[PDB]
Design a protein around this nucleic acid. Sequence first.
DNA 1: AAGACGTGGAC
DNA 2: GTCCACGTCT
Length: 344
Amino acid sequence: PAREFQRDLLDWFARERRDLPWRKDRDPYKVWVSEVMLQQTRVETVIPYFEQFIDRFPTLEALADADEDEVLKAWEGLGYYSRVRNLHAAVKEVKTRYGGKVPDDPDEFSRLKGVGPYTVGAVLSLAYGVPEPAVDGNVMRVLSRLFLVTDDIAKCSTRKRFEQIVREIMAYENPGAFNEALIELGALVCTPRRPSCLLCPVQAYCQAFAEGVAEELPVKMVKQVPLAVAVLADDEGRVLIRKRDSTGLLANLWEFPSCETDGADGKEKLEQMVGLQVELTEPIVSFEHAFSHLVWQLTVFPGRLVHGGPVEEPYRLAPEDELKAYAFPVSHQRVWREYKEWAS
DNA sequence: AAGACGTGGAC
DNA sequence: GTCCACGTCT
Ligand code: SF4
Ligand code: NA
């Protein structure tokens, strides 16, 4: 019944489509950036980041040529920072290998870092009209209600089932519009809770509504880590930071020196981490910071720093007015904030 | 397969 | 407290 379905979905879309910033044009670069930013991140949160990011890096080439530190800083606070290291890498490769043109072949484009099945579909259909599915969580939710698919939406193969369904119902005339429309329906009408089935423009075609189970779809099925953080300052008030490893948690961001302590043993694991002279005073605060897959229980220890050799390794001696120029995870921004108000 | 990988806001 | 939030790499 796809031909009817298309027109009713596309009609609704033409009326209800939000004028979001990345919807101003179909520049493949602007689309790509916005899709990367929208991964596991709400639209309202993304809007200001996208505007500043495009301000700072207006073209794919501008992004490619920026220092990675300048690119992390722009992403500071968005979460899932490797999304941006991959985008930065993929863009550099588009500039050098594809002459600054986002490739329109699905196979070539998917080879770029951070680009998976969803982003292939999203970017190529909207920028170039390539008829590839663009199944995200919204689409998965819509399709699961529309076709009463009770497969655990977390299973790897489940998406592949949804992608097949898109290939056979999609408006091959206008794939971008169609894909866009399906996503917008998930966002505006067919929502995680209390979907507005009474208002929905494809309600006639929907098995979950007919069966009375829209609400129960889709079907879908964390460790605590103590952290001791050191805030060490000069008599000149310069502060000691360090750049995290290029791999693992919060890759490449800056932080106040810290280590995992396993419980509340002491402030010695901290002081020991030498390699220059430090003595630490009583801790001033403890608060916790949540990630998707773990929770840091931080305890910050103010302390005095004395110089006994060069600062190297990933460590850097930062004057206070310059902290603002580095990218810190939110947890460490709070470390600085609590330390500063304590200093009152 | 299924875990690593940030964050904020509705409820 | 839970869910959003399959997105992608591993
Ligand atoms: S009818 Fe209700 S459930 Fe079916 S698609 Fe429209 S909103 Fe989703
Ligand atoms: Na890829």
